[PDB]
């Protein structure tokens, strides 16, 4: 075939156009050359397929020695023809030959399918061993979330995925391995050993590996579990007015702890960034540096986001204040320094936001919309998710809003530090004070009549779904979906 390759090359070069294009376009430009196809795409695939299936020989067979296994006409039925072709330069055939091949003909090897299509058989295994339960026909509350459609063996960014695929199934053309093969050496060797002994076309394996590695994420309405295993069956599990019980047939906590430890270690020293990145890229979790699960999940705890910023990775640009994730909707707040007396009687000089603003606010499982003016909280809409999460959301939004009532509600003292022993800004000191003593600003905040309406219903200081709610707070019996346009905008690291 290499001789056929050289003969075809010589014949192609005999024309001057081939000589001038080949000697002109560099290897990089080849992509452009490939994309100059006719693009005479069929206007209606259904009609085309219908017509073709009725034709004598619609199948376009590639020239080869396979045809000799089957006669051009078997049992008085025409199968294949020896007429030349112009579109593909091969032969023509009919589905009759395909059915005969499925009936008789050469018998192939069954080994390759045990491991090559591992993801599909794992899907089948998770389906078969799953345990079903009852069906709840009552209404189901669903939230729109960014979910991973399918489980991944090891989530990696697209470029690393492509490089790994090439390093696996393309032994040649592997110049200068980057700082990605050492991270995924175990995956490289495992997939290499598994796929060895096959004869499938390499492109099929490459696409299957891309599916098995590159992540696929989408906005979906979900209620309950969110792991890819449950998302696979979301079409059956969920339902607008029906729900089903399903149980399909870790590293996260460890990475959270490691990132927190790195942050605490680096902060106490001077120039924390270099020390933190040194420890982060010098760390490992049982087979791999920390850039193997940090790069896997989207965002995460604030410590992980800070470490990813210190390292090279993309982090969602949501504003983290304590535990609150804030997304601005409108308005511009002018941060101006001001001297304000605290409820304890002391006077603090801190930055206050002049002007009106609104933020989508998230905390754990609680979502809401907050609208605040300078030195005052104006409105807050929430959904009933969890008592702990709701209390955290209320208190944190209270502290963030810098409402004068929150300042006047202080009763103890603010001189706290961190595990590293540092004095924080008054905002975070107040955050810690109020979270430690939740029943401090709640009592003196003041109460507001219940939100008289079809669905809007109040919540009391104890987080129970009780009327006579807090001033401003409102709980709507609907679904609040927020945090759109996750641009991952450019963010600097000090």
């Amino acid at each position: 075939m290499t001789l056929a390759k050289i003969e075809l090359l010589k014949q192609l070069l005999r024309d001057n156009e081939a000589k001038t294009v080949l000697k002109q376009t560099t290897v990089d430009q080849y992509n452009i050359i490939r994309k100059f196809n006719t693009s005479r795409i069929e206007k209606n695939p259904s009609l085309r397929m219908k017509w073709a299936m009725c034709s004598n020989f619609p199948l376009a067979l590639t020239k080869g020695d396979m045809a000799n296994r089957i006669p051009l006409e078997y049992k008085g039925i025409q199968l294949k023809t020896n007429a030349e072709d112009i579109g593909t330069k091969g032969q023509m055939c009919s589905i009759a030959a395909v059915t005969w091949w499925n009936t008789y003909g050469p018998i192939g090897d069954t080994e390759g399918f045990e491991r090559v299509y591992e993801s599909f058989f794992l899907r089948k295994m998770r389906l078969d061993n799953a345990t079903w339960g009852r069906i709840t026909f009552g209404p189901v509350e669903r939230v729109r979330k960014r979910v991973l459609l399918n489980p991944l063996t090891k989530e990696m960014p697209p470029d690393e995925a492509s490089n790994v695929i090439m390093e696996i199934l393309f032994p040649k053309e592997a110049g200068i391995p980057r700082e990605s093969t050492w991270i995924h050496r175990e995956l490289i060797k495992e997939k290499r050993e598994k796929l060895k002994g096959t004869m499938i076309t390499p492109i099929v394996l490459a696409y299957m590996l891309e599916r098995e590695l590159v992540a696929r994420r989408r906005f979906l309405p979900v209620a309950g579990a969110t792991s890819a295993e449950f998302i696979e069956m979301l079409h059956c599990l969920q339902g607008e007015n029906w729900r089903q019980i399903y149980h399909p047939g870790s590293r996260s906590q460890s990475m959270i702890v490691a990132c927190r430890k790195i942050i605490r270690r680096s902060i106490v020293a001077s120039n924390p960034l270099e020390l933190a990145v040194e420890i982060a890229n010098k760390t490992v979790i049982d087979t791999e540096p920390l850039k193997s699960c940090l790069a896997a999940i989207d965002g995460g705890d604030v410590a992980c986001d800070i470490i990813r910023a210190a390292l090279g990775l993309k982090i969602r640009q949501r504003q983290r204040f304590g535990r609150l994730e804030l997304k601005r909707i409108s308005g511009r707040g002018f941060k101006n320094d001001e001297e304000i007396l605290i409820g304890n009687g002391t006077i603090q000089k801190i930055g206050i936001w002049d002007g009106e603003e609104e933020f989508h606010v998230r905390c754990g499982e609680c979502r809401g919309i907050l609208k605040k003016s300078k030195m005052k909280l104006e409105k807050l809409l929430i959904n009933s998710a969890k008592k702990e999460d709701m209390r955290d959301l209320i208190i944190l939004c209270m502290v963030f809003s810098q409402d004068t009532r929150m300042f006047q509600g202080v009763r103890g003292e603010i001189n706290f530090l961190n595990r590293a022993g540092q004095l924080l800004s008054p905002m975070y000191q107040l955050q810690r004070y109020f979270l430690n003593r939740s029943n401090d600003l709640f009592d003196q905040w003041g109460y507001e009549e219940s939100p008289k309406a079809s669905e809007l219903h109040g919540i009391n200081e104890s987080m129970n779904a009780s009327d006579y709610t807090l001033k401003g707070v409102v709980v709507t019996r609907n679904v609040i979906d927020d945090f759109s346009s996750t641009e991952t905008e450019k963010v600097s690291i000090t």
């Binding site: 960034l273 270099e274 990145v277 890229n281 910023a309 090279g312």
Partner: protein, 49 residues
């Protein structure tokens, strides 16, 4: 280009290059190629040493 710089270079080298550019009053954003060149220079120097 800045995305490539962030991906292929450590944050430390990027910080050093940005500091060097600031010393010369040159904006890293307006001359991303120069920032990449400075980052490569720092990286090769560290690799040599």
């Amino acid at each position: 280009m800045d995305t490539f710089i962030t991906r292929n270079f450590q944050t430390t080298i990027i910080q050093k290059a940005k500091n060097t550019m600031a010393e010369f009053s040159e904006d890293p954003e307006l001359q991303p190629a120069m920032l990449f060149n400075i980052c490569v220079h720092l990286e090769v120097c560290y690799v040599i040493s």
